[PDB]
Design an enzyme around this catalytic site. Sequence first.
Site, PDB file in Angstrom:
ATOM      1  N   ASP A 152      16.723  -3.003 -15.028  1.00 11.28           N
ATOM      2  CA  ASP A 152      16.950  -3.777 -13.831  1.00 11.28           C
ATOM      3  C   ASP A 152      18.156  -4.703 -13.886  1.00 11.28           C
ATOM      4  O   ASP A 152      18.095  -5.822 -14.374  1.00 11.28           O
ATOM      5  CB  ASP A 152      15.684  -4.572 -13.570  1.00 11.28           C
ATOM      6  N   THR A 153      19.265  -4.256 -13.325  1.00 10.69           N
ATOM      7  CA  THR A 153      20.495  -5.051 -13.327  1.00 10.69           C
ATOM      8  C   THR A 153      20.361  -6.283 -12.452  1.00 10.69           C
ATOM      9  O   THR A 153      21.192  -7.204 -12.647  1.00 10.69           O
ATOM     10  CB  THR A 153      21.721  -4.236 -12.908  1.00 10.69           C
ATOM     11  N   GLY A 154      19.407  -6.323 -11.539  1.00 12.62           N
ATOM     12  CA  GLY A 154      19.187  -7.494 -10.705  1.00 12.62           C
ATOM     13  C   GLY A 154      18.333  -8.554 -11.317  1.00 12.62           C
ATOM     14  O   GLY A 154      18.102  -9.577 -10.679  1.00 12.62           O
TER      15      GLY A 154
HETATM   16  C1  LIG Z   1      15.180  -9.970  -6.310  1.00 13.21           C
HETATM   17  C2  LIG Z   1      16.086 -10.059  -7.532  1.00 13.21           C
HETATM   18  C3  LIG Z   1      17.276 -10.989  -7.299  1.00 13.21           C
HETATM   19  C4  LIG Z   1      15.313 -10.483  -8.787  1.00 13.21           C
HETATM   20  N1  LIG Z   1      14.270  -9.558  -9.223  1.00 13.21           N
HETATM   21  C5  LIG Z   1      14.672  -8.260  -9.770  1.00 13.21           C
HETATM   22  C6  LIG Z   1      14.582  -7.092  -8.767  1.00 13.21           C
HETATM   23  O1  LIG Z   1      15.270  -5.987  -9.329  1.00 13.21           O
HETATM   24  C7  LIG Z   1      13.155  -6.672  -8.387  1.00 13.21           C
HETATM   25  C8  LIG Z   1      12.388  -5.958  -9.543  1.00 13.21           C
HETATM   26  C9  LIG Z   1      11.003  -5.563  -9.096  1.00 13.21           C
HETATM   27  C10 LIG Z   1      10.639  -4.223  -8.960  1.00 13.21           C
HETATM   28  C11 LIG Z   1       9.368  -3.818  -8.547  1.00 13.21           C
HETATM   29  C12 LIG Z   1       8.451  -4.810  -8.269  1.00 13.21           C
HETATM   30  C13 LIG Z   1       8.773  -6.129  -8.393  1.00 13.21           C
HETATM   31  C14 LIG Z   1      10.019  -6.526  -8.795  1.00 13.21           C
HETATM   32  N2  LIG Z   1      13.284  -5.710  -7.287  1.00 13.21           N
HETATM   33  C15 LIG Z   1      12.814  -6.028  -6.041  1.00 13.21           C
HETATM   34  O2  LIG Z   1      12.229  -7.073  -5.711  1.00 13.21           O
HETATM   35  O3  LIG Z   1      13.082  -5.013  -5.189  1.00 13.21           O
HETATM   36  C16 LIG Z   1      12.494  -5.011  -3.870  1.00 13.21           C
HETATM   37  C17 LIG Z   1      13.487  -4.291  -2.947  1.00 13.21           C
HETATM   38  O4  LIG Z   1      13.277  -2.904  -3.236  1.00 13.21           O
HETATM   39  C18 LIG Z   1      11.888  -2.681  -3.528  1.00 13.21           C
HETATM   40  O5  LIG Z   1      11.810  -1.910  -4.709  1.00 13.21           O
HETATM   41  C19 LIG Z   1      11.221  -2.686  -5.750  1.00 13.21           C
HETATM   42  C20 LIG Z   1      10.510  -3.854  -5.118  1.00 13.21           C
HETATM   43  C21 LIG Z   1      11.238  -4.072  -3.814  1.00 13.21           C
HETATM   44  S1  LIG Z   1      12.796 -10.217  -9.674  1.00 13.21           S
HETATM   45  O6  LIG Z   1      11.926  -9.132 -10.027  1.00 13.21           O
HETATM   46  O7  LIG Z   1      12.414 -11.116  -8.633  1.00 13.21           O
HETATM   47  C22 LIG Z   1      13.014 -11.177 -11.159  1.00 13.21           C
HETATM   48  C23 LIG Z   1      13.430 -12.488 -11.134  1.00 13.21           C
HETATM   49  C24 LIG Z   1      13.789 -13.135 -12.347  1.00 13.21           C
HETATM   50  C25 LIG Z   1      13.694 -12.380 -13.547  1.00 13.21           C
HETATM   51  N3  LIG Z   1      14.027 -12.964 -14.740  1.00 13.21           N
HETATM   52  C26 LIG Z   1      13.265 -11.049 -13.543  1.00 13.21           C
HETATM   53  C27 LIG Z   1      12.934 -10.473 -12.361  1.00 13.21           C
END
Ligand SMILES: CC(C)CN(C[C@@H](O)[C@H](Cc1ccccc1)NC(=O)O[C@H]1CO[C@H]2OCC[C@H]21)S(=O)(=O)c1ccc(N)cc1
Lengths: 99, 99
Positions: free
Chosen positions: A25-27
């Site tokens: 996860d690059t995000g």
């Molecule tokens: C929103 C980002 C700036 C940050 N996130 C990482 C992100 O990649 C999450 C990672 C993620 C993935 C699955 C479930 C929860 C979180 N993806 C996400 O929320 O994506 C949403 C949009 O597309 C959909 O696909 C996945 C969930 C939906 S995060 O999960 O909130 C997070 C925040 C801080 C840390 N240290 C680690 C992770």
Amino acid sequence: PQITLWKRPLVTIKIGGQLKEALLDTGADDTVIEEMSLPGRWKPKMIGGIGGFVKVRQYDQIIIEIAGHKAIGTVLVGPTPVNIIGRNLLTQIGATLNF
Amino acid sequence: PQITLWKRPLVTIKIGGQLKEALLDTGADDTVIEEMSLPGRWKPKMIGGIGGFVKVRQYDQIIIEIAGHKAIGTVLVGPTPVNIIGRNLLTQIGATLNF
Ligand SMILES: CC(C)CN(C[C@@H](O)[C@H](Cc1ccccc1)NC(=O)O[C@H]1CO[C@H]2OCC[C@H]21)S(=O)(=O)c1ccc(N)cc1
Ligand SMILES: [Cl-]
Ligand SMILES: [Cl-]
Ligand code: NA
């Protein structure tokens, strides 16, 4: 490897003696894993995203093997819906995004 | 380019004639941007982030430039902490993760 993004980029990791599936996860700034025990000291932390904040335990200096590549760093443990390998460990295995 | 992950992989996007900053996010299935006006009809979608599920507005077939690369696809609008470019558009620009 070169991993396309047609599907979620899931890999096998080894952490705390356990094999788990995790998302590259690059995000994510920080690596966050579902509830498990890890050795040593920890401190509480709040991390936030879509949906808001969750409380996690921060463990430092944890060794992880990610798709066969060893790395050490901080691991957050808490109620994440998916195990996530964030940038803090992706850098250590030399991961880059290319286009 | 080849983007390393020592800092957040932020790029400029252009959407609706306006430049914005966004995060290249391999952990996001979908592209989600902060509140803004987009043309056409929208459909409802629930997405689940780290803190729980949120409602967003789904706009299909939106013209968006990502770090200078043209894409046309789905954009979700809703309460995200940062603009996120997810896999639906990362695939359009030919991005891969490499290690
Ligand atoms: C929103 C980002 C700036 C940050 N996130 C990482 C992100 O990649 C999450 C990672 C993620 C993935 C699955 C479930 C929860 C979180 N993806 C996400 O929320 O994506 C949403 C949009 O597309 C959909 O696909 C996945 C969930 C939906 S995060 O999960 O909130 C997070 C925040 C801080 C840390 N240290 C680690 C992770
Ligand atoms: Cl670290
Ligand atoms: Cl490097
Ligand atoms: Na420790």
